[PDB]
Swiss-Prot record:
Protein name: Ras-related protein Rab-4A
Protein's gene: RAB4A
Keyword Iron-sulfur: no
Organism this protein belongs to: Homo sapiens
Residue window of the full protein shown: 8 to 189 of 218
PTM statement from Swiss-Prot or TrEMBL: Phosphorylated by CDK1 kinase during mitosis. Serotonylation of Gln-56 by TGM2 during activation and aggregation of platelets leads to constitutive activation of GTPase activity.
One BP annotation, GO: vesicle-mediated transport
Length: 173
């Protein structure tokens, strides 16, 4: 009720990486495109308005009108598909070009439950994240692991940047 901020989030990344299932897990706490949820972050209630690009990756969603105004984005790859990890630089560039240069991004390496099929290590991706000014978590939309955490860390960093005067909360974000 007493929600104090409203942030537009994107969920972006290659087709097949689990973007739809991540949102269903976050909102409904089940495995299984728009969603909204209010979370409490350090005593502030934040409404998230989540634009999930599932099924619209090959080009429909990759536009100024869709990205515009997003304060945060979950950039999703699949730990079992190296190509989806190689595509991150493309998606990072998209997000910065089409939303803004200061969009807050969290890298999500999804399907961590598929340990036997892993093609991208945690350590390599963590190093990449550190190099590209990115938060990073591995997630499983299947089990729920780190799903809530991904949205919450993204929201917390946005609030931190509002506090630091790096982000204008009435601007894009
Ligand atoms: N085992 C496992 N499978 C997943 C996970 N997330 C998504 N999937 C599967 O990956 C495929 C694509 O997921 P989906 O959410 O439709 O991908 P999208 O195209 O990015 O929306 C489907 O077969 C899902 O069942 C996960 O965390 N673990």
């Amino acid at each position: 009720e007493t929600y104090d901020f409203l942030f537009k989030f994107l969920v972006i990344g290659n087709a097949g990486t689990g973007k739809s299932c991540l949102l269903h897990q976050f909102i409904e706490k089940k495995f299984k495109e728009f969603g909204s949820k209010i979370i409490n972050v350090g005593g502030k209630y934040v409404k998230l308005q989540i634009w999930d690009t599932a099924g619209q990756e090959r080009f429909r969603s990759v536009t100024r009108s869709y990205y515009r105004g997003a304060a945060g984005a979950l950039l999703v790859y699949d730990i079992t598909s190296r190509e989806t990890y190689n595509a991150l630089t493309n998606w990072l560039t998209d997000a910065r070009m089409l939303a803004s240069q200061n969009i807050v991004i969290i890298l999500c390496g999804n399907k961590k439950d598929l340990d036997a099929d892993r093609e991208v290590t945690f350590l390599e991706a963590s190093r990449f994240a550190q190099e590209n000014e990115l938060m990073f978590l591995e997630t499983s939309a299947l089990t729920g692991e780190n799903v809530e955490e991904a949205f919450v860390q993204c929201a917390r960093k946005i609030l931190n940047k509002i506090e630091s005067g790096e982000l204008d909360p009435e601007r894009m974000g």
